[PDB]
Write a protein that binds this DNA or RNA. Structure first.
Length: 61
RNA sequence: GAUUAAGUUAUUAAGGGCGCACGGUGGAUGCCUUGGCACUAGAAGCCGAUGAAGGACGUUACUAACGACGAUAUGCUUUGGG
């Protein structure tokens, strides 16, 4: 799953937070406009792995 | 079936009336319940400057409205049932 394969490192949270938010979900919503019904189930999963990366940083407060 | 007169009583149905048969529109009655109303027993009787009651605008792969949700948005973490 993803829920506790995270808790890996403090600094590598935001350096992966900016890696999936900025550089994956932005590519997967431009390609939805120009024509793609190939993987329209990746947009739910790379959005529900941002919520797991912005929940763990509250436990480190 | 006339040859002449005299005398009678009919048939018609453009359409209407009564009876019967067969059709349409119309949604009464019959049979049901998702919703109500009237009340007994146990809880319960407050939320709001740490920003309330109520809301507008948003959220799905494609979203017009209600539902539940808030840029972590048709859901996220954890402890238990299943």
């Amino acid at each position: 799953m993803k829920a506790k394969e995270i808790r890996d490192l403090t600094t590598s949270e935001i350096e992966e937070q900016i890696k999936s938010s900025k550089e994956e979900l932005f590519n997967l919503r431009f390609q939805l406009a120009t024509g793609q019904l190939e993987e329209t189930a990746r947009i739910r999963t790379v959005r529900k792995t941002i919520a797991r990366l912005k929940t763990v940083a509250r436990e480190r407060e």
